[PDB]
Amino acid sequence: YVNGETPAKIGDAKLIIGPLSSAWSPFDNKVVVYGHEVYNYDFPEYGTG
Amino acid sequence: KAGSFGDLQSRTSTSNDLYANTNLKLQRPQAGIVHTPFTQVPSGFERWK
Amino acid sequence: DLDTHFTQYKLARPYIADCPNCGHSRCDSPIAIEEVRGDAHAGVIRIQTSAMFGLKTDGVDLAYMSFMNGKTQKSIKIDNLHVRTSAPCSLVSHHGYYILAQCPPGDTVTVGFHDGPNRHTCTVAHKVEFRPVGREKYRHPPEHGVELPCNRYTHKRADQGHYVEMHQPGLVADHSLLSIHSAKVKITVPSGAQVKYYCKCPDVRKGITSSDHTTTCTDVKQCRAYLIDNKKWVYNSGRLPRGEGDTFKGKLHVPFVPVKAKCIATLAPEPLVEHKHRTLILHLHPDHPTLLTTRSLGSDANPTRQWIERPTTVNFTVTGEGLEYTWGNHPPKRVWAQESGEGNPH
Amino acid sequence: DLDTHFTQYKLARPYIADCPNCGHSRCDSPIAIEEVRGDAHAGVIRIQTSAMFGLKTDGVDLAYMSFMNGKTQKSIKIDNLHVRTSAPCSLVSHHGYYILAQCPPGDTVTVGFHDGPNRHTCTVAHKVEFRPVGREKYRHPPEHGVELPCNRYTHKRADQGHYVEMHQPGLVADHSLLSIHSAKVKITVPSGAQVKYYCKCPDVRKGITSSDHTTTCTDVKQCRAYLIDNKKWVYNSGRLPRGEGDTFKGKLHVPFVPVKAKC
Amino acid sequence: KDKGAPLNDVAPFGCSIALEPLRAENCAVGSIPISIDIPDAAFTRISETPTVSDLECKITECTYAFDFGGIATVAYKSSKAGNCPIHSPSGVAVIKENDVTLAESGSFTFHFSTANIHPAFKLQVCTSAVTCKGDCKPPKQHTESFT
Amino acid sequence: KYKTKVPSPVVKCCGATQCTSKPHPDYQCQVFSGVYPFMYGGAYCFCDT
Amino acid sequence: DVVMTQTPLSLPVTPGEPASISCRSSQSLLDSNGNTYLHWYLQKPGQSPQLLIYGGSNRASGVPDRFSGSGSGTDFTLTINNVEAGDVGTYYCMQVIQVPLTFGGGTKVDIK
Amino acid sequence: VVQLVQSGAEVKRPGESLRISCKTSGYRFTDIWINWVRQRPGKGLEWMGSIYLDDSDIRFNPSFQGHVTISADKSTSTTYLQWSSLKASDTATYFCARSVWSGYYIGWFDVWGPGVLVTVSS
């Protein structure tokens, strides 16, 4: 995991990485998944078509 | 130039020193069937014409 | 499998539904067309007709077809069962009400079978399109290329994933079984149906198994016979009258259902890369409308997507952080470019 | 003329070849389209198939065809030999491996002959176009106009302009000529050709004239046979296996070579 | 039919998009704080390792390309035979080689990559530091500071 | 215009074959592994790789 | 080796009505592709035999529409829709599938 | 028209050799099987052997090794049937017959020769 808390046992040595220096993520609040691909269609409608 | 106007450049109308730079590649035969698939840029003389 | 075919024998019959342009005009045809489903990619379509293929009058006998020629379910050999869209489709299978075929693109879908003296054609107006997979717009499944995941209509005989309803057939109106006995209308029950009859004044609105002749009407033109049968069911179609059989939401598996499969997609000719430093020239020589999509691998993606339809030359700006381009069904390629030696700092 | 079929008979014969979209699937069909040539100015196209036309089993008798129905070069009358791209093509001639037809514009090329039990239809995805002559686009040749020079495929049976090479067939695999005699693999022979074979541990690697039963294999699944023949040649197709007999750079004239005519 | 481009093809920082957990793989942005805890057994007493002094670093030839377009050679007078590491903590050059076998009068060579015209990196070889000023290198996917 | 003729591929039951260059215009050669081709009735190349 | 048997060993018949001859073999003559390797020959008395039917069902050149061949697997049948006086002589069923390729024992058709 | 012709009928004694020949005409391809068959007096025929003209590929009956030999000649398009030591059981009609190549099978014998009659008595 990439965060300051959780360690990791690679062999015997104990590893801690993170947190990521930036919170940027390619996604956004609403996305659409079709097939093997994902689109940033920003307005899926909840019950209003 | 692999299909602009000169890619099969023959010295005479019947010479045996064909140049023939046409980016000829070869694909795999899938699903166990005997054939020779290939891919290649279309003809340059036809493009010119 | 045959068990599903046998379960389709249980109560399903052919029916004469309304068809537009039965060759040259509207009619009521033994083989109608309802809900043609062209949604696959390679080109396969499924047509739910109004005739039972396979099932003959006695068993399954895959090489036989059955259809309603009036008051009789009649079975014959499948001698020439053709489907045309714009050129003769190569029908791949048939079962129950459903044909599965491979058609080219076109604006019409027409089915037809030979009885030998008759052709019994049915032509519906339904736009059907070639739906190529991947990022190249080919127009026929190619000989070679790369397998991509597509959704096509399975050629399997049966599957229980999807269903369709069965309902009791509506009372079938008729007048051919009405005659004149001496000077009075007569209803000739066909020995197997309880013919309801409605005529000039209100009459017995249930019918009777015995032949009847009513005195409140003299000429056939004010009297008509609803032939009914509750021994075989029909699929509830929008082109049939709904009877009072509002029970028995019967079920039928849909034979050919959409499933995932592998479709061949054209590998386009490889482009000529001229990596003149500080940029990247790309000579593209397609044979079908192909896609070219590029993105920079920096903080600004700066995407560029375009459909190349003919030989073309496009120049992209490769900075020191990276560029990526994908062309046709080829995998994405990446290039990082800098360190050009133009000029002299000394 | 007659001698062209007598250089097309000497060693050439039909052959079964891979065919896409053979009906609704992929076939090892007897009439397999390969190297269709649409380049003329009237929509006239010549296609090289894998089933001999004209030639019957003794002479020419130019109404017949012969194809490789398994292990017998079966000949029939040309009853309905049809060619289509978008609408049926009015075929004009046939010779040896080649058909020559006048096709409308389309995006596929499909051919097929009738035999009575089956249809044997092959199809290939080709971009056949209708190339007009001059400076006006047509989509069908007109009734009247100017006579302009156009390059079209001659319908003449004979010409020595171009050739294709005929090559000795490879080792035609066949698993239908093996059985279990009593409890062991037995290899039947077609009485006229020698069959090579290969089984569990390496066996006789050159074939034999007569039948045999191999005790190193008790299951038909692990041994198989490549029927071989050296009496009739084929044309070296990309979809046929090349034989170890890498010799005989033979010749076969192309009937309908292009010519300059008037359109 | 008329969708825009996918996020697999317009995502910045060059990352593909796996679908099953709906991930964004290999999207190189930012930095990673790192803290490793190595076992004490991994270390050895410096008595048995080669001491390194009487050192000099001559740059032979290099070019500031992405790949390891660099060669340098260090002359050195041995203390004892052994095998000990190399590393350049500066940001100018990145070194391919990890460890070197130092024999008697062990003079060795190492390849590296840099983005500078005149480098200024300092190599450190087995507990001692040598500064290779570097030559004026010519021009002509990997690690470059480029500052 | 040109024409890409293809000689018949040589398919060997067991074992591999390293191919040779030739002085042909636009010559291309490739050897593929794990084909297991099929034909009209028959199961060519039983070796399975 | 395969052994062929013909029934009847002799067939008396007059013109006007059909005739049938049944040949049989040890094992099936068919292939996976459905093709029969029989050849029915006729030998009139005095001259050499001539090929009458080939392929078991297919019809050789020169002979009339009259004759016919049929059958499957091991059992094959020659039929004559109506005999004439000219058909006197010996009929012979032969196979080819396995060397030696052997003729049948024979059957003799003669005017009653 | 195609014509297949054999040598005339012959009478021989046991113990010597013999060679009969069959010639093809009216058919100008060598992609042909030409074959021999023996009919004894009053008994049926027995396929005896076959030869392909082009490659001289042989197909022998297992009842006629050593006793008999079949060879072919290209220039004259002929087949020679050769006996080294005739026997008292070689009294019969011999027919040469023509089977055009049709797949990997001997085929059907579309035209036969006139039929030679070779008799060896005591």
Side-chain angles (χ1 to χ4, degrees):
Chain A
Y1 293 54
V2 171
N3 61 308
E5 282 74 337
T6 308
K9 267 288 185 253
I10 296 81
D12 168 313
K14 216 171 61 39
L15 169 61
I16 287 171
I17 37 177
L20 208 40
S21 70
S22 74
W24 178 95
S25 170
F27 311 103
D28 46 331
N29 76 9
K30 282 209 263 181
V31 299
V32 167
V33 172
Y34 182 45
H36 62 57
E37 38 201 347
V38 312
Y39 309 84
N40 267 15
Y41 199 60
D42 263 298
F43 282 96
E45 306 85 320
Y46 319 97
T48 87
Chain B
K1 265 283 169 315
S4 206
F5 160 72
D7 55 350
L8 174 136
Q9 305 167 137
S10 159
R11 192 59 35 165
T12 49
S13 177
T14 63
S15 157
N16 318 46
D17 57 13
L18 223 38
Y19 168 67
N21 168 38
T22 46
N23 269 328
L24 193 44
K25 289 329 178 196
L26 292 177
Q27 312 302 22
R28 256 186 65 84
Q30 70 282 71
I33 65 201
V34 183
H35 72 310
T36 297
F38 59 97
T39 186
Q40 151 184 268
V41 288
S43 152
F45 177 52
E46 188 197 299
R47 150 154 141 90
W48 178 74
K49 228 199 284 172
Chain C
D1 61 356
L2 314 194
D3 51 295
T4 59
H5 219 172
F6 297 149
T7 311
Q8 199 148 359
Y9 198 95
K10 76 177 157 306
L11 305 166
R13 70 176 226 225
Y15 47 92
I16 300 187
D18 163 40
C19 171
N21 175 317
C22 311
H24 68 86
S25 44
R26 239 189 204 275
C27 90
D28 318 320
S29 65
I31 184 171
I33 292 186
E34 330 185 357
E35 182 241 29
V36 55
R37 294 217 74 71
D39 286 19
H41 278 163
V44 296
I45 68 187
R46 191 194 71 213
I47 300 158
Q48 176 183 3
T49 76
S50 77
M52 301 215 88
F53 311 95
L55 306 193
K56 57 175 172 202
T57 185
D58 153 31
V60 153
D61 175 1
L62 230 45
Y64 264 51
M65 163 196 30
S66 162
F67 67 104
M68 221 57 152
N69 172 231
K71 326 194 164 71
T72 86
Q73 180 174 322
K74 108 182 292 196
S75 308
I76 47 168
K77 179 181 301 314
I78 322 185
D79 65 345
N80 188 329
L81 161 61
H82 61 274
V83 193
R84 305 198 323 283
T85 288
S86 305
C89 316
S90 70
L91 78 170
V92 51
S93 164
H94 51 60
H95 175 252
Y97 298 125
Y98 300 77
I99 299 175
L100 183 79
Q102 292 235 14
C103 290
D107 305 303
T108 67
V109 183
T110 167
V111 306
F113 70 87
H114 288 58
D115 194 17
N118 330 105
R119 304 301 140 100
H120 290 135
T121 320
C122 181
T123 300
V124 290
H126 178 276
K127 161 92 180 313
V128 70
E129 334 197 343
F130 202 81
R131 264 188 243 283
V133 299
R135 309 154 69 78
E136 318 196 356
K137 301 271 209 68
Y138 61 92
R139 287 177 279 289
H140 200 29
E143 172 185 46
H144 56 290
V146 65
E147 298 236 297
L148 306 182
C150 60
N151 49 352
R152 68 183 316 120
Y153 282 115
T154 195
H155 73 256
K156 295 301 250 310
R157 165 58 33 66
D159 172 35
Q160 290 318 299
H162 298 85
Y163 295 94
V164 75
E165 258 158 20
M166 262 185 328
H167 279 16
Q168 156 82 11
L171 74 183
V172 184
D174 197 314
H175 76 323
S176 55
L177 77 175
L178 257 53
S179 160
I180 287 297
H181 209 26
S182 52
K184 188 190 311 309
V185 287
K186 194 224 194 169
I187 289 142
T188 63
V189 158
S191 94
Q194 313 144 80
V195 169
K196 171 194 296 300
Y197 57 93
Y198 188 92
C199 321
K200 180 249 164 191
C201 271
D203 312 290
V204 178
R205 232 152 174 274
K206 71 123 174 177
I208 35 167
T209 322
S210 45
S211 203
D212 189 348
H213 29 284
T214 45
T215 45
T216 199
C217 38
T218 36
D219 52 351
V220 281
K221 194 152 51 43
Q222 63 213 0
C223 197
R224 38 202 73 253
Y226 311 99
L227 190 54
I228 70 189
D229 162 33
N230 67 274
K231 290 163 253 298
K232 287 294 256 288
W233 274 241
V234 297
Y235 145 82
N236 51 312
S237 40
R239 344 181 78 71
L240 290 178
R242 167 151 46 156
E244 311 66 50
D246 48 8
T247 73
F248 197 64
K249 324 306 215 185
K251 226 155 276 307
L252 273 145
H253 75 129
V254 168
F256 325 103
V257 285
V259 312
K260 310 299 293 192
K262 303 299 225 197
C263 288
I264 312 296
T266 49
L267 263 281
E270 302 213 326
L272 288 86
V273 309
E274 280 190 15
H275 200 206
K276 95 162 171 53
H277 270 287
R278 314 291 301 101
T279 195
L280 170 78
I281 299 118
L282 214 49
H283 319 291
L284 307 152
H285 298 88
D287 42 358
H288 315 269
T290 317
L291 242 191
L292 179 75
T293 298
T294 71
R295 58 157 181 178
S296 64
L297 315 193
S299 147
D300 208 322
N302 193 348
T304 291
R305 144 166 173 139
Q306 87 205 57
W307 286 92
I308 313 279
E309 271 168 294
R310 79 187 38 80
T312 302
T313 304
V314 307
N315 313 305
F316 298 123
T317 303
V318 194
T319 36
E321 67 213 355
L323 191 83
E324 155 166 281
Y325 70 95
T326 177
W327 147 262
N329 298 296
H330 292 254
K333 304 268 279 282
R334 300 196 174 192
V335 295
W336 300 259
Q338 83 201 55
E339 200 205 13
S340 71
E342 82 306 340
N344 180 239
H346 319 130
Chain D
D1 39 14
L2 259 282
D3 48 356
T4 74
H5 286 273
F6 306 155
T7 207
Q8 215 93 5
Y9 208 150
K10 269 185 182 359
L11 309 164
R13 93 196 208 271
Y15 55 93
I16 286 202
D18 157 80
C19 165
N21 201 329
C22 158
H24 57 90
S25 63
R26 215 178 241 282
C27 276
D28 310 90
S29 97
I31 169 157
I33 303 129
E34 61 216 29
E35 191 259 357
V36 315
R37 281 218 84 68
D39 284 74
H41 283 145
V44 65
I45 74 182
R46 182 205 80 206
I47 80 188
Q48 191 246 307
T49 81
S50 74
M52 321 276 298
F53 302 103
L55 297 156
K56 52 151 53 143
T57 202
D58 53 89
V60 311
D61 182 353
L62 184 85
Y64 282 87
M65 51 144 48
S66 64
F67 59 95
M68 211 75 238
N69 180 250
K71 315 194 249 288
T72 179
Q73 186 208 290
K74 160 151 60 163
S75 37
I76 42 159
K77 283 178 57 46
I78 290 168
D79 49 357
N80 194 26
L81 177 75
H82 65 79
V83 186
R84 341 189 304 263
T85 87
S86 303
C89 309
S90 92
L91 69 142
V92 47
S93 176
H94 48 276
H95 173 90
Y97 289 102
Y98 307 82
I99 313 168
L100 170 52
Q102 296 209 354
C103 276
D107 194 328
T108 76
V109 164
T110 180
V111 308
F113 59 83
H114 282 5
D115 193 10
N118 205 357
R119 278 339 174 189
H120 294 141
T121 282
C122 191
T123 301
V124 157
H126 198 244
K127 174 81 190 312
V128 58
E129 301 181 48
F130 177 90
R131 300 152 190 286
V133 152
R135 315 169 67 176
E136 316 181 0
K137 313 300 188 28
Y138 354 118
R139 294 151 281 271
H140 197 104
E143 193 193 26
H144 52 261
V146 289
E147 280 252 318
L148 263 154
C150 61
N151 46 8
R152 68 182 317 95
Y153 298 133
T154 186
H155 61 76
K156 297 182 88 71
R157 208 89 53 202
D159 193 324
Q160 304 330 118
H162 319 82
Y163 302 77
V164 305
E165 338 180 341
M166 49 198 332
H167 277 37
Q168 147 64 33
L171 318 160
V172 186
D174 192 348
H175 83 77
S176 66
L177 78 180
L178 277 35
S179 40
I180 309 302
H181 195 174
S182 53
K184 219 76 82 171
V185 165
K186 172 189 166 16
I187 293 173
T188 78
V189 172
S191 92
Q194 36 267 68
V195 312
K196 176 152 114 134
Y197 59 107
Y198 207 104
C199 318
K200 180 248 168 185
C201 283
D203 272 273
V204 169
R205 241 178 156 285
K206 68 106 189 170
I208 46 170
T209 320
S210 181
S211 197
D212 182 347
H213 42 276
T214 53
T215 197
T216 194
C217 49
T218 203
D219 195 344
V220 74
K221 184 172 301 263
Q222 76 213 107
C223 185
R224 60 201 58 190
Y226 314 91
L227 201 169
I228 88 163
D229 184 320
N230 81 90
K231 320 211 194 326
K232 283 296 231 296
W233 270 247
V234 306
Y235 150 80
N236 49 330
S237 190
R239 62 196 69 220
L240 260 176
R242 168 156 57 184
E244 282 102 348
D246 53 1
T247 71
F248 202 83
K249 289 64 58 190
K251 235 66 174 169
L252 274 191
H253 81 114
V254 163
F256 317 106
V257 307
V259 298
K260 275 297 197 89
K262 306 295 228 186
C263 287
Chain E
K1 196 192 307 311
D2 57 21
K3 68 193 92 156
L7 190 125
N8 311 51
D9 308 336
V10 313
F13 298 118
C15 38
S16 46
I17 298 283
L19 203 88
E20 191 46 10
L22 184 59
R23 314 169 255 137
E25 294 218 315
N26 318 336
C27 211
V29 68
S31 266
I32 310 276
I34 174 75
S35 309
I36 196 93
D37 174 286
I38 302 182
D40 298 33
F43 305 90
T44 84
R45 313 309 311 217
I46 193 145
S47 317
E48 44 267 30
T49 54
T51 307
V52 166
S53 60
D54 188 12
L55 204 53
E56 162 205 339
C57 183
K58 184 224 181 173
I59 192 133
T60 74
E61 173 268 350
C62 155
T63 172
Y64 54 101
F66 294 169
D67 64 319
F68 288 124
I71 305 97
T73 191
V74 296
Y76 157 66
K77 222 205 73 52
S78 183
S79 72
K80 64 184 282 289
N83 173 302
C84 64
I86 299 167
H87 164 60
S88 158
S90 202
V92 195
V94 153
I95 288 155
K96 184 202 294 171
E97 281 104 348
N98 314 137
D99 69 336
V100 280
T101 65
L102 282 168
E104 313 313 329
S105 266
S107 168
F108 64 83
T109 85
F110 75 100
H111 326 106
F112 74 101
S113 151
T114 180
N116 261 120
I117 317 96
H118 325 283
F121 76 103
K122 58 161 293 226
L123 194 131
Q124 97 187 44
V125 48
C126 322
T127 322
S128 73
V130 49
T131 182
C132 323
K133 216 278 168 184
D135 266 318
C136 171
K137 306 328 298 157
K140 194 62 61 192
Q141 193 179 112
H142 212 250
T143 88
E144 310 294 313
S145 46
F146 193 6
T147 69
Chain F
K1 216 195 167 273
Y2 62 77
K3 146 167 95 167
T4 57
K5 97 155 309 197
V6 303
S8 290
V10 52
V11 169
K12 196 157 72 59
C13 174
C14 271
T17 182
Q18 314 91 25
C19 91
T20 170
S21 149
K22 286 205 266 284
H24 282 311
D26 221 346
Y27 194 65
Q28 299 292 122
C29 197
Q30 272 229 57
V31 187
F32 308 106
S33 304
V35 281
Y36 190 48
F38 287 71
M39 301 295 258
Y40 90 87
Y44 221 107
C45 286
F46 98 103
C47 313
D48 273 42
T49 307
Chain G
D1 182 58
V2 61
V3 295
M4 322 212 76
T5 82
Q6 280 158 281
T7 53
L9 211 63
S10 290
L11 208 149
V13 86
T14 79
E17 71 295 20
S20 315
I21 314 189
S22 175
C23 166
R24 184 152 301 81
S25 150
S26 84
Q27 73 290 33
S28 181
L29 281 290
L30 295 214
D31 37 44
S32 37
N33 323 279
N35 212 312
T36 88
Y37 306 99
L38 244 70
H39 311 310
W40 287 97
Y41 304 89
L42 174 53
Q43 179 167 36
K44 307 215 181 57
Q47 64 278 63
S48 311
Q50 82 201 10
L51 162 54
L52 165 90
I53 270 166
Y54 81 122
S57 183
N58 274 97
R59 177 102 44 65
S61 97
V63 316
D65 155 20
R66 285 218 331 282
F67 297 73
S68 307
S70 159
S72 92
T74 51
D75 73 85
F76 302 145
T77 67
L78 196 168
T79 311
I80 319 187
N81 61 327
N82 54 67
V83 183
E84 333 319 333
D87 324 286
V88 68
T90 325
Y91 290 110
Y92 284 120
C93 90
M94 161 185 208
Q95 62 83 22
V96 181
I97 63 161
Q98 183 154 230
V99 75
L101 60 168
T102 87
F103 293 80
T107 196
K108 275 179 290 204
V109 79
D110 76 336
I111 197 54
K112 153 57 212 167
Chain H
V1 77
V2 69
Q3 225 48 70
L4 211 48
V5 292
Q6 298 155 272
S7 38
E10 276 196 324
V11 312
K12 293 281 263 199
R13 274 281 171 211
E16 62 253 28
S17 75
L18 172 61
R19 148 186 280 191
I20 53 175
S21 66
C22 168
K23 186 85 155 49
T24 283
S25 60
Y27 184 109
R28 47 182 142 152
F29 326 134
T30 61
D31 71 6
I32 176 57
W33 291 92
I34 217 61
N35 73 27
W36 294 98
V37 66
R38 179 183 82 190
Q39 188 184 40
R40 302 229 63 177
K43 333 175 190 184
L45 309 98
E46 301 146 290
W47 174 80
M48 201 174 98
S50 314
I51 178 56
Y52 201 73
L53 261 289
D54 265 21
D55 50 345
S56 53
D57 183 87
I58 313 279
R59 205 70 35 180
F60 254 105
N61 192 297
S63 296
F64 295 81
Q65 307 69 304
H67 195 163
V68 198
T69 290
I70 297 159
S71 60
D73 198 32
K74 298 284 299 304
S75 41
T76 88
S77 79
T78 284
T79 172
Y80 300 131
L81 182 44
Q82 211 305 295
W83 278 285
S84 53
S85 162
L86 319 89
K87 305 301 199 55
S89 163
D90 311 358
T91 87
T93 39
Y94 297 93
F95 305 99
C96 75
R98 214 213 68 176
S99 94
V100 58
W101 192 95
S102 311
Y104 334 104
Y105 282 101
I106 288 302
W108 49 89
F109 317 144
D110 57 359
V111 309
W112 303 52
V116 77
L117 181 53
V118 164
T119 189
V120 168
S121 64
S122 83

